[PDB]
Amino acid sequence: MVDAFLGTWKLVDSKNFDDYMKSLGVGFATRQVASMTKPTTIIEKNGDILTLKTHSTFKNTEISFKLGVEFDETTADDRKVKSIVTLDGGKLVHLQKWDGQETTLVRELIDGKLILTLTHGTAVCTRTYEKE
Ligand SMILES: CCCCCCCC/C=C\CCCCCCCC(=O)O
Numbered sequence: 406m407v408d409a410f411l412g413t414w415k416l417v418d419s420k421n422f423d424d425y426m427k428s429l430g431v432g433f434a435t436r437q438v439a440s441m442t443k444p445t446t447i448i449e450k451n452g453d454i455l456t457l458k459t460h461s462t463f464k465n466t467e468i469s470f471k472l473g474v475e476f477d478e479t480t481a482d483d484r485k486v487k488s489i490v491t492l493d494g495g496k497l498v499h500l501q502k503w504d505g506q507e508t509t510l511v512r513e514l515i516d517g518k519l520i521l522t523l524t525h526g527t528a529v530c531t532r533t534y535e536k537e
Pocket residue numbers: 416426431435439442444446459460461463464465466480481482521532
């Protein structure tokens with residue numbers, strides 16, 4: 406089930422996010438702001454549709470999707486990607502594909518905390534979110 410991911414989460418730790426952003430071609434100015442931003446992520450369900458909001462003082466995003474069904478997404482850094490989200494080993498796995506590249510955004514619950522692992526190229530970033 407997806408239900409233990411649901412709720413409101415705030416960033417409390419981040420490792421290697423600059424590497425991840427630079428691997429995606431994000432410019433220095435955006436990387437600078439992003440290194441100091443602590444987003445709030447809200448994940449809600451209505452039937453088979455999940456909505457994931459990411460809010461901050463610089464950028465906001467919102468996506469709605471059905472697990473296992475491709476959707477178009479315009480990311481926070483303005484990539485237009487083809488996305489699919491699924492549950493795999495109890496993790497929420499979001500795969501983005503564009504121009505032959507791939508990145509994964511994988512969420513795992515460990516001791517009530519939401520660990521987001523971002524992988525692109527050789528860059529691996531780990532972000533820790535705490536429940537609200
Ligand atoms: C909507 C705010 C999320 C972060 C704000 C600024 C980041 C913009 C630059 C790179 C984004 C790369 C893809 C999105 C990263 C998601 C990180 C997260 O949810 O913690």
